[PDB]
Design an enzyme around this catalytic site. Structure first.
Site, mmCIF file in Angstrom:
data_model
loop_
_atom_site.group_PDB
_atom_site.id
_atom_site.type_symbol
_atom_site.label_atom_id
_atom_site.label_comp_id
_atom_site.label_asym_id
_atom_site.label_seq_id
_atom_site.Cartn_x
_atom_site.Cartn_y
_atom_site.Cartn_z
ATOM 1 N N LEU A 114 -85.124 30.507 -46.637
ATOM 2 C CA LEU A 114 -85.191 29.359 -46.320
ATOM 3 C C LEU A 114 -86.153 28.393 -47.523
ATOM 4 C CD1 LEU A 114 -85.586 30.742 -42.792
ATOM 5 C CD2 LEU A 114 -84.662 28.401 -43.387
ATOM 6 N N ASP A 115 -86.705 27.532 -46.931
ATOM 7 C CA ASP A 115 -87.568 26.654 -47.822
ATOM 8 C C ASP A 115 -89.014 26.867 -46.880
ATOM 9 O OD1 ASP A 115 -88.681 25.495 -49.795
ATOM 10 O OD2 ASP A 115 -87.034 23.577 -49.341
ATOM 11 N N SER A 116 -89.907 26.682 -47.438
ATOM 12 C CA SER A 116 -91.275 26.446 -47.598
ATOM 13 C C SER A 116 -90.929 25.124 -46.436
ATOM 14 C CB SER A 116 -92.116 26.411 -48.253
ATOM 15 N N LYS B 182 -89.266 16.760 -54.693
ATOM 16 C CA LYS B 182 -89.952 18.353 -54.687
ATOM 17 C C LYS B 182 -89.460 18.910 -55.563
ATOM 18 C CE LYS B 182 -87.346 22.500 -52.525
ATOM 19 N NZ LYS B 182 -86.797 22.700 -51.429
#
Ligand SMILES: CCCCCCCCCCCCCCCCCC(=O)OC[C@H](COP(=O)([O-])OCC(O)COP(=O)([O-])OC[C@@H](COC(=O)CCCCCCCCCCCCCCCCC)OC(=O)CCCCCCCCCCCCCCCCC)OC(=O)CCCCCCCCCCCCCCCCC
Ligand SMILES: CCCCCCCCCCCCCCCCCC(=O)OC[C@H](COP(=O)([O-])OCC(O)COP(=O)([O-])OC[C@@H](COC(=O)CCCCCCCCCCCCCCCCC)OC(=O)CCCCCCCCCCCCCCCCC)OC(=O)CCCCCCCCCCCCCCCCC
Ligand SMILES: CCCCCCCCCCCCCCCCC[C@@H](O)O[C@H](CO[C@H](O)CCCCCCCCCCCCCCC)COP(=O)(O)OCC[N+](C)(C)C
Ligand SMILES: CCCCCCCCCCCCCCCCC[C@@H](O)O[C@H](CO[C@H](O)CCCCCCCCCCCCCCC)COP(=O)(O)OCC[N+](C)(C)C
Ligand SMILES: CCCCCCCC/C=C\CCCCCCCC(=O)OC[C@H](COP(=O)(O)OCCN)OC(=O)CCCCCCC/C=C\CCCCCCCC
Ligand SMILES: CCCCCCCC/C=C\CCCCCCCC(=O)O[C@H](COC(=O)CCCCCCC/C=C/CCCCCCCC)COP(=O)(O)OCCN
Ligand SMILES: CCCCCCCCCCCC(=O)SCCNC(=O)CCNC(=O)[C@H](O)C(C)(C)COP(=O)(O)O
Lengths: 84, 124, 124, 459, 88, 128, 70, 178, 63, 55, 55, 175
Positions: free
Chosen positions: E42-44, H51
Site C-alpha cells: 500500500l502507498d503512503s 508523485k
C-alpha cells in the site's frame, strides 16, 4: 443494568454498491478513469431502513391524513348536532 | 403604499404630510358641519379606566366588551358579538381617517389648480 | 535578541516573538497542558496577555485588513441607511387620531381651572 | 469608654504570664470577649454623641470602626498561629504584645475628642506596625518597605502638627465639639490655602491618594499576614476618618481646593483597576484593589454631601472586611505553595472545594454585588458624584467594569483550569482556615440586614 | 451516555471490518499482524486514507505524529485501546 | 492565482504560508538540531526531578522566577530618562488629569451659571 | 425508566411502537387543531373588513367644490 | 502526543499532512457521502500526478501554491471532532481528573473503606520505589555525554527492570474519571 | 402518602405563616398593601352603598 | 455504532408538556386576557398577508 | 410568553439529538433522523412551524 | 384598623362591584376562594385569637416622649455655648420631623398613584400638588446646607434668601 449483550457485527460481504447512488460516483470516476476504494465502506448508509427518504414538504405534513379525517368527522358531527 | 412613493418621488407639495394635517378649515367643504357624537361621559369612562389611548370615540363598545368578559369569566369565548361590534366601530373610525386624508389631498389638488389658473390668467 | 536599549526597563530579557500562546502545538506533550508551556523554557514578557483566556493572534481565514474593511463598511452603511429612512419615513394614508373631550385635556395633565381652547372634530 | 481600654491593657499581663503552650487560646478568647463588650457602643442616638468624659467620646462614625478594630484581633491571632509554630515563646509573646498595642492605640485614636491627642495616637499607631513589618517578614525587601511606610506617612503628617498648634493658638481650643460649634469660614488667601493643604495632605497620604500610593504595595507585600490585614482593614481608614473629622473647618475653601485631589482620585481609580489586570502577584493585586477603593472613598469625602458621607462609611467597613478576607485566602495559598505567584498554582478548586467556595464569595463581595454593603456604599457614592457632575458616571462605570474583570480574573486563574502537575503538597484545608474565612464573611452578610449601623452620623 | 464499554476484541473486530471493506486489499490475505507497506503493498497516501477511515469510524481523531507511524492493524488496535483506557 | 493573505499584528502568518522553512540550508538544520537538543535537555531534567518518589514539594522553575523578577523588581534599575520615555511619561501621566479637570470645571461652571440665572428647574431635587 | 435498547452497528435502530404512535398522534393533533381553527376563524388571516378604495369616493361627501365657488 | 517529535519535518511528512488537511476540509465542504467520495477521488488524482517528480527544487516549488490554494478554500468553519483541541468537548472532563497522590492525604476513616484498593496501592508504591532507583542509574549510564539530543526514552533492557520514568505515564487518572 | 406529607410541610405551612404575617403584621401599618380599585362599569351594583350605576344613553345599534 | 434511543419517560413527558403548550397556550392566552391595544381591524389584503408571503 | 414555550422546545429537542448522537453538535454529522427519532422530529417540526409563524 | 389614624393617611371609600354571573358555568375563583378560606384563614384566625388572648392576660403601656421648646439660634448669644447646644439639638429634632413629614406625603402620593390604576394622571392631582408644595418648602429650608450642616448655616441661608427677596420686592415697588 447496562448494555451488555455481546453484540455481533454483521458480515462484511453484505454491503454492496448496488442499489445506492454510489453508482453515479463510480461511473463518473470510471469515465475519467479512476475508482473509489472506499465505496462499499459507506454502503450501509443507503442499505437498511435508511434507504427510504422523505421530502421536506412531506416531512412537514407528518400527520395530515389522520388530522384531516378527524377534522372532517368533527365538522360533520357539529353540522348534524347544531342543526337541531 | 403607493402614496409614499408618490411623495418621495413626485412633488412633495402635491399631497400632504401626516404631521401638519389638516391644513384647511373644517367648514371649507360644506357649511352644515355635523359634529361627532360621544355616548360615554368622562366619569363612567374614568371608572372603567380603559387606557389613555383607548379613550376614543369607540369607547362604549369597549366598555361593553369588558363588561361581557368580566361577567362570563369561565367561558372565555362566551361573548363575541360585542367584540365584533367594537372591531366594526374601529373600522369605521379608520374609514373616517382615510376620508380625512383623501379630502385633504383633493382640497390641496383644487387649491393648486386654482393658484395655477390665477397665475396663468395674470400672465395672459 | 534583547529589547532595544531604550528608557523602558526591559534590560536583559529576550524579545520572544509576539506569537500567541493559544496556537502552540496542541498535541505536543507540554509540561503545563493548559498554558501550553514547557518547564524551564524562556517565558514571554507578555505571557499573562496570551494565556488562551485573552487576546490570541491565531491566523484567520480572511485577512485582518479585509475583515476590518468589511465590518466597518457594513456598520457605516447600516447607520447611513437608518438615517436615510428616518429622513423618508413610512406611514399609512390616514389622518391624525381624534379624541373626544378637547383632545382628552382633563385626562392628560389636568389643570381644570384654565378652560382650554376647545377643539371640535369634523365628521366626514 | 474605659470599660474597653482597661481590658485591652490587661491583655498584656494576661499574655505575658500565660503558659508557653496556652498563649494563643487565652489571647483569642479574651479578644473575642472584648469584642462583645465593644458591641454596646453601636447603639448611637440621633443627637450629638455619647460624650463619655472630657477625653473620650463616641459617635456613629467611630462606633463601626471601633467594633471592626476590636473584632479584627482574634482573626489576626488565628492567622498568625500558622507561621509562628517554630518561634520561641518570648518572640511569640512579643508578637502578641505588638498586636495588642496596635489595637489599644487604634481604640484610643478613634475617639480622641481632642485633635492633638488624636494626632499623637495617630502617629503612635506607626511604631508597632513598623516593628511587625520589619521583624516578622519573609522577604529581604521588608526593610525598604518599612522605610517607605514610615517616611511617606511622616513627611505628610509632620506639617499637620504645625497646622494643629497654629489652629489652637488662633481658635483657642482643639476639642472637636468646640471646633464644630464655633466653626468660621476660611477666607480665600494663600495662608489659608497652605493651612488647607497641611491639614489635608497628612490624611490623604495615608488613605492613600493616587500618586502617593507607592508605599502601600510594598508594605502589603512584604508584611506578614497579620500586618497585611491590619493595614488593609483599619490602618487605611485612619486617613478617611481624620479627613471627615477635619473637613468641618476647611469650608468654603474646599469648594475649589478639592479639584486636584478629585481629578487624581477619579483617574487613579481607573489606573489602579487597570493595573490589577496585568499582575503577576496576588498580594500586589489585592493591594492595588484597596488603592482603587480608597480612591473612591476619597472622592466621596471630598464631594461633601450626606449621601457621600454615608457611602464613604459603608465602603470603609465593607472594604476592610473584604480585603482582610482576600489577604487571608492568599496567605493560605502561599503557605502550601511557598511561592506567592498567581499562575504557579492552578486548578485548586478540584483539590480544595470549600476554599474555592470561600474564594468565590470573597470575589463576589469585592465585585460589589447587591445587596451587600459593598454595593450600598458604592451606589451611594455614585449617586452623590452624579449629583456633583453628570460626567462622573463614565469614570465610575469604567471602574466598575474593570473591578469585575480583575476580580473574576483572580478567581479564574487560581481556581479554575487544570491543576499544576508538579505540586503534590496541597494538603486538605485545616479547620482553622475555614473558621477564619467563615468569621470574615458572616459579619458582612449579617450587616447587609441592618445597614443603618454602618451608615455614619448623617443617616 | 449509555455507551457500552468497548473491549479489545470488539476493537479488533471493528478494525478488521473497516479494513475488509477497503477493496485495495484482499480480505483473505490480511491478518491482524499484516503490514501495510510491504505485506500489502500500500502507498503512503493509502495508509493515510486508512487512518482517516478509522478516525471517522471510531469518532476520535489521531494526531499526525502518531498516525504516520501505525503500520499494522494490531498496533492500531493497541493505540486505540491506550487512548480509550481498555482493560481487556 | 489567488488573493494573498496579508498578516498583521493580531493575525500572524501561518506556518504553512511562511517561506523560511522552504529555503532550507544545512545551517538551518543545525539550528533546529540545537533547539531540539536544549529543549530535550530541559525536558529530561524536569522529568528526572518530577518522577522522584522522595520529592514532596514544588519543582522550582528558574524561568518563572526570572520572569517575575524581570517584570516586577528589575524595571527601575534599567530605567534611563530619554526623550521618548520622558515624553510618554509626561503625556500619559499629566494629559488625562488636566483633560478631566477641564471637562469637569466647564460642566460645573455651566451648572453654577444656570443656577445663578435660576433657569434650571431643580424641583424635587431633595436628596443630594 | 425505559426499556433495554441495544446498539445496532450499521443497521436501523429498534423502534418501539409507543413512540411511533405518540408522534403520529401529536402531529395529527396539531394538524387537526390548525384545520379546525381555520374553519371556525377565517378572518384572522384573510381579514374581515374590506379595505375602502379612496378613488371611488365622490367629491360630494369629501367637501370639494367644482373649482369656481372658492 | 505519545511519540516524541523530530527536529524537523521531512518533505514526505509535509505532503502527507497537507493531504490529510485537504481531505478533511473537502469533507467539511461536501456534506454528503457520495459527493465527498467523488471529490476525494478527484483530489487524490490531482494529488498523485506529481508523485514521481525527481528534483527537489520543483517539488518544493510545488506544495507552496498548494498551501496557498488550501488557505484560500479552507472552509473557515471546519469540522472538528468533539474531543479534538477545537471540539465542543475538548477539555470537558479535565475538572474531574484528581491526581493519584491525593489519596495519600485521605483520613484513616476514609481509608477504612476500600481496604483492598489501598493494599494494592502500597504494593504499587513499593514497586515504584525500587524501580526508580534502578531507572535513574540505567538512564545515567545510557545517555550520551553532553546531554540528550532527542526526548525519546529507552525501554527496559534487563529482566526485572522497568522503563525509565513510567510512574506518571502509567498512573494517568483516566479518560473519563467521572 | 409522599405527596400528602409534601403538600403539608412544603405548601400548607408556608401559606399559614405568610397569611398570618400579611394579615396581622404587614396590614397593621398603613399603605403596605395597596390594591388597584376594581373597574366600575355601567350597570353594576356597589356592595358598600347599594347604589346602581346608570346605564348608557342607548347608542344607535346597527350591525 | 448506532446508539439512538429516546425511550425514557422523562424526556418524552418533558417534551410533550411543552408540545401541548406550544400548540394551545397561544390561543388560550390571546383569548383569555382583556384587550390593551387598539386593534388593526382594516388592512390592505396584500399587506395583511405580508408575513405569510415572506415566510 | 410565546417565545419561551417554543424556543425551550427547540433547545430540548436539540439536546435530545446531541445526547443520542454521542455528544455531537455539528449538523454535518446528523443524517436521517426523521424515521430514527420519530417523537423528536415531530416535536422539532411543530416547534419550527410555530417559530416561523404558522397560522 | 385603628392602629393608624385615618385622617393622616386618607383612603377613598373603595366601592366594589357585585357578582353578576351571566352563565351557569361555575367559576373556579369562587370555589378556590372558599377552600382557601376554609383551610387557611380559620387556623390562622384561631392561632391569632390564642396569641391575642395570651397578650391580654399581661398588659402594660409605653408612652410617647414629649419635648419642651427651647430658644432658637436666633435668640442665642455669640459665644454662649450652652444656648447654642440647646438650639442646635432642637434644630436637629425639627429636621428629623420635617424629613418624616416629607416621607408621609411621599407615601400618600405613591399609594394614590398605585390605587388609581390607569387614571393616575388625573385622579391624584391633589397629591402631586401637595408633594410639590412640601418639596419646595423642604428644598428652601434644608437643601444645599452641606454635609456639616448646623443651625447657624440654615439661619445664614434664610437671611440671604430674605435679603434677596427684600431687594427684589423693593425694586419692584420702586419701579
Ligand atoms: C436565594 C436566597 C436563598 C435563601 C435561603 C437561605 C440561605 C442562607 C445562606 C446564607 C449565606 C450563606 C453562607 C456563605 C457560605 C456558605 C457555606 C458553604 O460553604 O456552603 C456549603 C454548603 C454544603 O455544600 P457542600 O457540598 O458540603 O460544599 C461543596 C462546595 O462548597 C461547593 O459549594 P457550591 O457549589 O454548592 O456553592 C456554594 C454556594 C453557597 O455559597 C455562597 O456563595 C453563599 C453566599 C451568597 C452571597 C454572595 C455575596 C453577595 C451579597 C449577598 C448578601 C445577602 C445576605 C442576606 C442575609 C444573609 C444572612 C446570613 O454558592 C452558590 O450557590 C452561588 C451563590 C450566588 C448567588 C447570587 C445571588 C445573590 C443575591 C440573591 C438575593 C439575596 C437577597 C434577597 C432579597 C429579595 C428576596 C427576599 O452549601 C450551602 O450551604 C449552600 C447554601 C445556600 C446558598 C445561598 C446563596 C444565596 C443566599 C444568600 C443569603 C440569603 C438571603 C436571604 C433571603 C431569604 C429568602
Ligand atoms: C501624579 C499622577 C501621575 C503624574 C506623574 C507622572 C508624570 C509626571 C512626571 C514624569 C514626567 C516629567 C518629565 C519632564 C522633565 C523630565 C526630563 C528630564 O528629567 O531629563 C532627564 C534627561 C537627562 O538628559 P541626558 O541624560 O544628559 O541626555 C540623554 C539624551 O540622550 C539626550 O537627549 P537629546 O540631547 O538627544 O535631546 C534633548 C532635546 C531634544 O528633545 C526632543 O527630542 C523633542 C523635544 C521634546 C521637549 C520639547 C517639547 O531636548 C530639547 O532640546 C527640549 C528642551 C526643552 O533628559 C532627557 O533625556 C530628555 C530630554 C527631553 C526633555 C523632554 C521633557 C518634556 C516633558 C514635558 C514637560
Ligand atoms: C431571649 C433573649 C434574647 C436576647 C439576648 C441578648 C443577650 C445579650 C448579651 C450580650 C451583651 C453584649 C455586651 C454588652 C456590654 C455593654 C453594656 C455594658 O457595658 O454594661 C455594663 C453591665 O454589663 C453587665 O453587668 C455584664 C454583661 C456581661 C455579660 C453579657 C452576657 C453574656 C456574657 C457571656 C460571657 C461568657 C459566658 C460563659 C462562657 C463559658 C455596665 O453597665 P453600667 O454602665 O453600670 O450601666 C449603667 C446604667 N444602669 C445603672 C441602669 C445599669
Ligand atoms: C504628585 C502626586 C500628588 C501630590 C499632591 C497634589 C496636590 C497639590 C496641588 C496644589 C493645589 C492647588 C494649589 C494652588 C491653588 C490656588 C489657585 C491657583 O493655582 O490658580 C491661580 C493662581 O495663579 C497662579 O497659580 C499662582 C501660583 C503659581 C505658583 C504655584 C506652583 C504651580 C506649579 C507647581 C506644581 C508642583 C506641585 C507638587 C509640588 C511637589 C488663580 O490666580 P488668582 O485668582 O490671582 O489667585 C487665587 C488665590 N487667591 C484668591 C488667594 C489670591
Ligand atoms: C468599551 C470598551 C471596553 C473595554 C474592554 C476591556 C477588555 C480588556 C480586558 C478583558 C479581558 C480579556 C478577555 O477576556 O479576552 C477576550 C475575550 C476572548 O475572546 P473570545 O471571542 O471569547 O475567544 C473565543 C475563542 N477562544 O473576548 C472578550 O470578552 C472581549 C470583550 C471586549 C468587548 C469590547 C467591545 C465593546 C464595544 C461596545 C460598543 C457598543 C456600545 C453599546 C451600543 C448600544 C447603545 C444604545
Ligand atoms: C508624601 C509627601 C507629601 C508632602 C506634604 C508636604 C506639603 C504640605 C503642604 C504645605 C506644608 C507647610 C504648610 C505650613 C503649615 C500650615 C500653617 C499655616 O497655615 O500658617 C500660615 C503660614 O503659611 C506658611 O507659612 C506656608 C509656608 C510654606 C513653607 C514650606 C513649603 C513646603 C512645600 C510647599 C509646596 C507643597 C505643596 C504641595 C505638596 C504636594 C505633596 C508633594 C499662616 O501664616 P501667618 O503667619 O499666620 O500669616 C497671617 C498674617 N498674614
Ligand atoms: C478545499 C481545499 C482544497 C485544497 C487543495 C490543495 C492542493 C491540491 C493539489 C496539491 C498539489 C501537489 O500534489 S504538490 C506535490 C508535492 N511534491 C511531491 O509529491 C513529490 C514526491 N512526492 C512524495 O514523495 C510523497 O511522499 C508521495 C509520493 C506523494 C507520497 O509518498 P508515500 O509513498 O510515502 O505515501
Amino acid at each position: 443494568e447496562h448494555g451488555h449483550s455481546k453484540m455481533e457485527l454483521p458480515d462484511y460481504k453484505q454491503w454492496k454498491i448496488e442499489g445506492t447512488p454510489l453508482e453515479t460516483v463510480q461511473e463518473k470516476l470510471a469515465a475519467r478513469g479512476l475508482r473509489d476504494p472506499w465505496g462499499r465502506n459507506e454502503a450501509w448508509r443507503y442499505s437498511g431502513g435508511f434507504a427510504n427518504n422523505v421530502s421536506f414538504v412531506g416531512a412537514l405534513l407528518k400527520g395530515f391524513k389522520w388530522g384531516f379525517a378527524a377534522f372532517v368527522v368533527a365538522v360533520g358531527a357539529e353540522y348534524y348536532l347544531e342543526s337541531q | 403604499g403607493a402614496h409614499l412613493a408618490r411623495r418621495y418621488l413626485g412633488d412633495a407639495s402635491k399631497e400632504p404630510d401626516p404631521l401638519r394635517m389638516p391644513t384647511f378649515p373644517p367648514d371649507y367643504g360644506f357649511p352644515e358641519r355635523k359634529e361627532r357624537e360621544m355616548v360615554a361621559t368622562q366619569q363612567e369612562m374614568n371608572d372603567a379606566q380603559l387606557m389613555l389611548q383607548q379613550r376614543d370615540y369607540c369607547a362604549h363598545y369597549l366598555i361593553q366588551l369588558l363588561k361581557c368578559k368580566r361577567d362570563s369569566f369561565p367561558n372565555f369565548l362566551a361573548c363575541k358579538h360585542e367584540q365584533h361590534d367594537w372591531d366594526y366601530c374601529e373600522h369605521l373610525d379608520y374609514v373616517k381617517r382615510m376620508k380625512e386624508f383623501e379630502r385633504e389631498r383633493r382640497l390641496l389638488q383644487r387649491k393648486k389648480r386654482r393658484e395655477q389658473r390665477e397665475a396663468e390668467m395674470a400672465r395672459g | 535578541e534583547p529589547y532595544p536599549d531604550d528608557g523602558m526597563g526591559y534590560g536583559d530579557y529576550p524579545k520572544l516573538p509576539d506569537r500567541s500562546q493559544q496556537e502552540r502545538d496542541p498535541w505536543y506533550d507540554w509540561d503545563h497542558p493548559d498554558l501550553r508551556l514547557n518547564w524551564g523554557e524562556p517565558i514571554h514578557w507578555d505571557l499573562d496577555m496570551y494565556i488562551r483566556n485573552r487576546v490570541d493572534t491565531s491566523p484567520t481565514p480572511v485577512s485582518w485588513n479585509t475583515m476590518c474593511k468589511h465590518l466597518f463598511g457594513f456598520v457605516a452603511f447600516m447607520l447611513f441607511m437608518f438615517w436615510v429612512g428616518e429622513i423618508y419615513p413610512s406611514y399609512q394614508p390616514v389622518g391624525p387620531k381624534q379624541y373626544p373631550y378637547n383632545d382628552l385635556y382633563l385626562e392628560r395633565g389636568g389643570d381644570p381651572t384654565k378652560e382650554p381652547e376647545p377643539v371640535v372634530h369634523y365628521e366626514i | 469608654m474605659l470599660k474597653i481600654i482597661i481590658p485591652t491593657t490587661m491583655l498584656l499581663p494576661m499574655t505575658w504570664m500565660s503558659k508557653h503552650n496556652m498563649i494563643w487560646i487565652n489571647a483569642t478568647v479574651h479578644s473575642l470577649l472584648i469584642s462583645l463588650i465593644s458591641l454596646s457602643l453601636l447603639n448611637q442616638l440621633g443627637e450629638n454623641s455619647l460624650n463619655f468624659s472630657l477625653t473620650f467620646f463616641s459617635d456613629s462614625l467611630s462606633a463601626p470602626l471601633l467594633v471592626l478594630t476590636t473584632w479584627l484581633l482574634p482573626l489576626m491571632l488565628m492567622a498568625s498561629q500558622s507561621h509562628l509554630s517554630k518561634e520561641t515563646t518570648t518572640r511569640k509573646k512579643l508578637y502578641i504584645t505588638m498586636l495588642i498595642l496596635l489595637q489599644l492605640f487604634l481604640i484610643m485614636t478613634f475617639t480622641a475628642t481632642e485633635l492633638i491627642l488624636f494626632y499623637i495616637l495617630f502617629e503612635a499607631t506607626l511604631v508597632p506596625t513598623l516593628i511587625i513589618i520589619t521583624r516578622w517578614g519573609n522577604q529581604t525587601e521588608r526593610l525598604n518597605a518599612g522605610l517607605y511606610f514610615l517616611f511617606y506617612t511622616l513627611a505628610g503628617s509632620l506639617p499637620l502638627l504645625v497646622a494643629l498648634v497654629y489652629i489652637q493658638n488662633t481658635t483657642g481650643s482643639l476639642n472637636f465639639l468646640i471646633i464644630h460649634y464655633w466653626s468660621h469660614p476660611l477666607s480665600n488667601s494663600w495662608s489659608n490655602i497652605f493651612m488647607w493643604l497641611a491639614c489635608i495632605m497628612a490624611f490623604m497620604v495615608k488613605m492613600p491618594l493616587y500618586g502617593l500610593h507607592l508605599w502601600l504595595p510594598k508594605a502589603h507585600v512584604e508584611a506578614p499576614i497579620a500586618g497585611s490585614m491590619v493595614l488593609a482593614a483599619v490602618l487605611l481608614k485612619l486617613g478617611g476618618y481624620g479627613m471627615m473629622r477635619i473637613t468641618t473647618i476647611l469650608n468654603p475653601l474646599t469648594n475649589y481646593m478639592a479639584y486636584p485631589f478629585l481629578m487624581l482620585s477619579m483617574w487613579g481609580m481607573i489606573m489602579t483597576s487597570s493595573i490589577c489586570l496585568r499582575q503577576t502577584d496576588l498580594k500586589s493585586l489585592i493591594a492595588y484593589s484597596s488603592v482603587s477603593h480608597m480612591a473612591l472613598v476619597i472622592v466621596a469625602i471630598m464631594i461633601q454631601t450626606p449621601w457621600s458621607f454615608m457611602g464613604a462609611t459603608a465602603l470603609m467597613i465593607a472594604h476592610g472586611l473584604t480585603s482582610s478576607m482576600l489577604f487571608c485566602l492568599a496567605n493560605t495559598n502561599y503557605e502550601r505553595v511557598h511561592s506567592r505567584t498567581m499562575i504557579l498554582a492552578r486548578g485548586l478548586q478540584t483539590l480544595l472545594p470549600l476554599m474555592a467556595t470561600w474564594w468565590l464569595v470573597a470575589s463576589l463581595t469585592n465585585l460589589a454585588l447587591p445587596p451587600s454593603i459593598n454595593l450600598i456604599g458604592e451606589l451611594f457614592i455614585i449617586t452623590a458624584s452624579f449629583s456633583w457632575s453628570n460626567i462622573t458616571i463614565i469614570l465610575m462605570g469604567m471602574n466598575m467594569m474593570i473591578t469585575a474583570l480583575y476580580s473574576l480574573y483572580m478567581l479564574i486563574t487560581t481556581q479554575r483550569g487544570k491543576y499544576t502537575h508538579h505540586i503534590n503538597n496541597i494538603k486538605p484545608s485545616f479547620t482553622r482556615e475555614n473558621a477564619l474565612m467563615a468569621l470574615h464573611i458572616l459579619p458582612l452578610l449579617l450587616l447587609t440586614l441592618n445597614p443603618k449601623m454602618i451608615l455614619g452620623p448623617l443617616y | 451516555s449509555d455507551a457500552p464499554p468497548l473491549t479489545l476484541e470488539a476493537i479488533k473486530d471493528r478494525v478488521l471490518y473497516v479494513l475488509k471493506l477497503y477493496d485495495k486489499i484482499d480480505p483473505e490475505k490480511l491478518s491482524v499482524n499484516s503490514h501495510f507497506m510491504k505485506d500489502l503493498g500500500l502507498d503512503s497516501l493509502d495508509q493515510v486514507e486508512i487512518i482517516m477511515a478509522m478516525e471517522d469510524e471510531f469518532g476520535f481523531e489521531i494526531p499526525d505524529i502518531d498516525a504516520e507511524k501505525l503500520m499494522c492493524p494490531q498496533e492500531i488496535v493497541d493505540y486505540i485501546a491506550d487512548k480509550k483506557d481498555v482493560y481487556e | 492565482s489567488f488573493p494573498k493573505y496579508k498578516p498583521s499584528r493580531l493575525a500572524t502568518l501561518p506556518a504553512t504560508l511562511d517561506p523560511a522553512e522552504y529555503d532550507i540550508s544545512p545551517e538551518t538544520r543545525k539550528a533546529q538540531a540545537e533547539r531540539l537538543a536544549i529543549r530535550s535537555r530541559l525536558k529530561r531534567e524536569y522529568l528526572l526531578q518530577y518522577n522522584d518518589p522522595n520529592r514532596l514539594g514544588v519543582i522550582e522553575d528558574p524561568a518563572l522566577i526570572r520572569w517575575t523578577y524581570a517584570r516586577s523588581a528589575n524595571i527601575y534599575p534599567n530605567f534611563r530618562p530619554t526623550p521618548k520615555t520622558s515624553l510618554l511619561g509626561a503625556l500619559f501621566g499629566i494629559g488625562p488629569l488636566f483633560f478631566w479637570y477641564y471637562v469637569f470645571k466647564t460642566d460645573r461652571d455651566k451648572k453654577e451659571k444656570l443656577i445663578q440665572e435660576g433657569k434650571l428647574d431643580q424641583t424635587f431635587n431633595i436628596s443630594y | 425508566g425505559g426499556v433495554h435498547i441495544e446498539p445496532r452497528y450499521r443497521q436501523f435502530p429498534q423502534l418501539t411502537r409507543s413512540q411511533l404512535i405518540q408522534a403520529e398522534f401529536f402531529s395529527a393533533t396539531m394538524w387537526f387543531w390548525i384545520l379546525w381553527r381555520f374553519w371556525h376563524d377565517s378572518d384572522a388571516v384573510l381579514g374581515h373588513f374590506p379595505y375602502p378604495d379612496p378613488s371611488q369616493w365622490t367629491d360630494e361627501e369629501l367637501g370639494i367644490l367644482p373649482d369656481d365657488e372658492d | 502526543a505519545f511519540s516524541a517529535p523530530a527536529a524537523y519535518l521531512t518533505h514526505q511528512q509535509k505532503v502527507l499532512r497537507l493531504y490529510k488537511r485537504a481531505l478533511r476540509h473537502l469533507e467539511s465542504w461536501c456534506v454528503h457521502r457520495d459527493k465527498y467520495r467523488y471529490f476525494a477521488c478527484l483530489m487524490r488524482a490531482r494529488f498523485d500526478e506529481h508523485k514521481n517528480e525527481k528534483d527537489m527544487v520543483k517539488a518544493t516549488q510545488l506544495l507552496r501554491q498548494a498551501e496557498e490554494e488550501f488557505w484560500y478554500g479552507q472552509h473557515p468553519q471546519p469540522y472538528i471532532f468533539p474531543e479534538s483541541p477545537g471540539g465542543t468537548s475538548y477539555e470537558r472532563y479535565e475538572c474531574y481528573k484528581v491526581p493519584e497522590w491525593c489519596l495519600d492525604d485521605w483520613h484513616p476513616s476514609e481509608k477504612a473503606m476500600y481496604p483492598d484498593y489501598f493494599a494494592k496501592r502500597e504494593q504499587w508504591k513499593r514497586l515504584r520505589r525500587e524501580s526508580w532507583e534502578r531507572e535513574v542509574k540505567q538512564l545515567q549510564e545510557e545517555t550520551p555525554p553532553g546531554g540528550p539530543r532527542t526526548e525519546a526514552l529507552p525501554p527496559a533492557r534487563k529482566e526485572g527492570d522497568l522503563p525509565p520514568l513510567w510512574w506518571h505515564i502509567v498512573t494517568r487518572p483516566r479518560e473519563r474519571p467521572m | 402518602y409522599r405527596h400528602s406529607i409534601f403538600a403539608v410541610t412544603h405548601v400548607l405551612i408556608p401559606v399559614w405563616i405568610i397569611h398570618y404575617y400579611l394579615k396581622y403584621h404587614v396590614t397593621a401599618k398603613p399603605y403596605t398593601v395597596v390594591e388597584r380599585k376594581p373597574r366600575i362599569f355601567p350597570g353594576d351594583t356597589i356592595l358598600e352603598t347599594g347604589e346602581v350605576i346608570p346605564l348608557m344613553k342607548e347608542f344607535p345599534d346597527q350591525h | 455504532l448506532v446508539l439512538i434511543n429516546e425511550n425514557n419517560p422523562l424526556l418524552i413527558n418533558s417534551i410533550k408538556r411543552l408540545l401541548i403548550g406550544s400548540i394551545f397556550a397561544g390561543f388560550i392566552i390571546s383569548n383569555n386576557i382583556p384587550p390593551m391595544t387598539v386593534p388593526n381591524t382594516t388592512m390592505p389584503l396584500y399587506m395583511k398577508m405580508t408575513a405569510l408571503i415572506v415566510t | 410568553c410565546m417565545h419561551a414555550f417554543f424556543k425551550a422546545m427547540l433547545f430540548m429537542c436539540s439536546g435530545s439529538i446531541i445526547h443520542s448522537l454521542n455528544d455531537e453538535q455539528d449538523i454535518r454529522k446528523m443524517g436521517g433522523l426523521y424515521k430514527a427519532m420519530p417523537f423528536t422530529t415531530t416535536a422539532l417540526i411543530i416547534g419550527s412551524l410555530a417559530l416561523t409563524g404558522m397560522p | 384598623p385603628d392602629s393608624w389614624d385615618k385622617d393622616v393617611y386618607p383612603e377613598p371609600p373603595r366601592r366594589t362591584p357585585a357578582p353578576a354571573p351571566q352563565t351557569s358555568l361555575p367559576n373556579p375563583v369562587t370555589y378556590l376562594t372558599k377552600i382557601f378560606d376554609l383551610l387557611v384563614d380559620r387556623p390562622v384566625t384561631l392561632a391569632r385569637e390564642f396569641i391575642e388572648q395570651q397578650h391580654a392576660k399581661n398588659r402594660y403601656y409605653y408612652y410617647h416622649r414629649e419635648f419642651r421648646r427651647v430658644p432658637d439660634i436666633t435668640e442665642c448669644e455669640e459665644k454662649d455655648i450652652l444656648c447654642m447646644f440647646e438650639a442646635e439639638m432642637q434644630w436637629r429634632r425639627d429636621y428629623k420631623v420635617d424629613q418624616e413629614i416629607v416621607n408621609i406625603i411621599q407615601e400618600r402620593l405613591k399609594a394614590c398613584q398605585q390605587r388609581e390604576g390607569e387614571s393616575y394622571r388625573q385622579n391624584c392631582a391633589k397629591e402631586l400638588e401637595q408633594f410639590t408644595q412640601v418639596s419646595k418648602a423642604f428644598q428652601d429650608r434644608y437643601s444645599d446646607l452641606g454635609a456639616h450642616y448646623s443651625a447657624r448655616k440654615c439661619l445664614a441661608k434664610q437671611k440671604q434668601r430674605m435679603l434677596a427677596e427684600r431687594k427684589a420686592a423693593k425694586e419692584a415697588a420702586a419701579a
